[PDB]
């Protein structure tokens, strides 16, 4: 029962929790270069992080 419980206890078929992402805090230089585009790129990053 101990061996069975230990084997059952872990989900090898599942994917582990990646480390958490703190806030972006984008730099003023990159913002000055790309004012309006970083929002679209961040949305695409969320889309790819969820789907891809």
């Amino acid at each position: 029962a101990l061996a069975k419980a230990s084997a059952a206890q872990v989900d090898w078929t599942s994917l582990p929790a990646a480390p958490p992402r703190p806030s972006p805090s984008a730099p003023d230089t990159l913002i000055r270069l790309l004012g309006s585009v970083v929002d679209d790129l961040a949305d695409a990053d969320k889309v790819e992080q969820k789907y891809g």
Binding site: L34, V37, L41, A44
Partner: protein
Amino acid sequence: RYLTALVEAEQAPPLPFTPDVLQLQLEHNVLKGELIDRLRALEYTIVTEQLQA
């Protein structure tokens, strides 16, 4: 994507469209002649206003 966004940013133009320079110089020359003729008519009326004054 950031590379392409930067290359597109630097290579983009001040305007968002492609102006047809010929039609713009056409409207410019027509409007110029209408403005010169308007100023000449206004000087023509100003002569009568500085006469009444």
